[PDB]
Ligand binder design. Sequence first.
Ligand SMILES: CO[C@H]1O[C@H](CO)[C@@H](O)[C@H](O[C@H]2O[C@H](CO)[C@@H](O)[C@H](O)[C@@H]2O)[C@@H]1O
Ligand SMILES: CO[C@H]1O[C@H](CO)[C@@H](O)[C@H](O[C@H]2O[C@H](CO)[C@@H](O)[C@H](O)[C@@H]2O)[C@@H]1O
Ligand SMILES: [Ca+2]
Ligand SMILES: [Ca+2]
Ligand SMILES: [Mn+2]
Ligand SMILES: [Mn+2]
Lengths: 240, 240
Amino acid sequence: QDSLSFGFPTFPSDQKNLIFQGDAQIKNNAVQLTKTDSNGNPVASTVGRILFSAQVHLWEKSSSRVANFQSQFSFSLKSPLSNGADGIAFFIAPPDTTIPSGSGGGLLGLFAPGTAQNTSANQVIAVEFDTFYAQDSNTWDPNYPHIGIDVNSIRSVKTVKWDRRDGQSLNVLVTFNPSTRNLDVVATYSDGTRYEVSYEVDVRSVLPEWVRVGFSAASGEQYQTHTLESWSFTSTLLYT
Amino acid sequence: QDSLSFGFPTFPSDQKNLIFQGDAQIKNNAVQLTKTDSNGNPVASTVGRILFSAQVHLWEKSSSRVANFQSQFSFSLKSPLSNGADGIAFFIAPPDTTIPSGSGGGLLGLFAPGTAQNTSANQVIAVEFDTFYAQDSNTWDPNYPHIGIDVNSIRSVKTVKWDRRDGQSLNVLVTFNPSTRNLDVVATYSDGTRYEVSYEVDVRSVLPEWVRVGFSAASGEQYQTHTLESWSFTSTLLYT
Ligand SMILES: CO[C@H]1O[C@H](CO)[C@@H](O)[C@H](O[C@H]2O[C@H](CO)[C@@H](O)[C@H](O)[C@@H]2O)[C@@H]1O
Ligand SMILES: CO[C@H]1O[C@H](CO)[C@@H](O)[C@H](O[C@H]2O[C@H](CO)[C@@H](O)[C@H](O)[C@@H]2O)[C@@H]1O
Ligand SMILES: [Ca+2]
Ligand SMILES: [Ca+2]
Ligand SMILES: [Mn+2]
Ligand SMILES: [Mn+2]
């Protein structure tokens, strides 16, 4: 289909169109990307991702069209630790994408250690909300919590300072306009605090015509829950 | 998802989200539900169906919600003859639906011979565009071409006389309103000729909470092409 849209105001346990990978599962009408014990407390060494089952037609070589898409979602992070890790990301990748071996912790379940910073070895666009930046392990990160745009590498092509707020929901709108090739990210907390970051990228040179969209999160030695609360997505092929 | 929508203005050959059953295949940017020869001419004894891969949440027992839905599509029928058969139908059924054994010809690939008129043995709602009504084989049909609403039986609960026009595209709009429980069908030819048929039905007592939507067509001894040219669908779970 040239156009596709879907909306999850909440996430009931009865799901049919979501692909669950790793430890991701539904609990209390929300998606818990990372594992939690019986009491709902976060645990270390966990990775989980979800993908919508239907493939999205991102661009069409034959017709020279590229999709205009928008992804709106909200999530919350919670941890009794002073340095919860590692973060959550909205991503777009080839339909057969699976969790890379050893992609835990700071790799957010998106990249393999050996090629995490090799742009020619990956096919993924992601918007990360990174809460762990220890310069000793996450050497590629700026020294503060941040929102980053990742294009085929864990070392973001761009980042902006972000404030992690325990237990508070962050509303995010990610948009891509094929006319300007601008990928815009706008995130807000309920008190009006706003974060914005944009990057120009030709998705045709990074991703295949058909892709899947979803979320990924991970916790290494440090941990926190990564709770996806709602998600709506829409895409439509347009003439460029 | 509480809401889902998709649109196929045309049908390019590289499809990813369509389930093809029987003889259905893409040819010339359109879906040919029934088999055709090398020169594109219709052949006898053929059945074909397509279903969208993502499941639709028609109703939810927990929230007591029921979805409204709208399906818009256009198709054309062509035959060297005139008594083209057998017809095409838009249908909704359980996700694991497959072509029933011996459902060719007048059964439109939707019902099994032994239970075609047994409402307690089927789970399907369909809007049929029936062009063959010979009483020797289609005893359940009125004596003329027609559009009918089928609820668990090949014997339509409601029909309206219809005119078959070789090679002309018929634009159809099917809508279900959960508030009134009315399933409305409006079909029109380019010159404005309009056909309307409606029926009140509680989808909750006929179909499971999750379903798949699609099209089916068949040709027994008489034949014609059943070409699906475009299709858009949208559904939203609502409180009533
Ligand atoms: C206390 O953990 C920090 O220090 C440890 C010892 O140097 C590191 O092993 C550890 O790295 C792992 O956890 C972080 C945070 O979850 C993660 O980003 C990294 O990829 C490792 O999984 C961390 O630096
Ligand atoms: C000439 O075909 C008509 O008469 C035949 C002899 O009685 C029938 O077998 C035949 O029925 C089959 O074809 C029709 C039209 O395709 C179909 O509706 C029916 O299910 C049988 O397949 C038809 O009545
Ligand atoms: Ca990090
Ligand atoms: Ca018939
Ligand atoms: Mn980072
Ligand atoms: Mn009929």
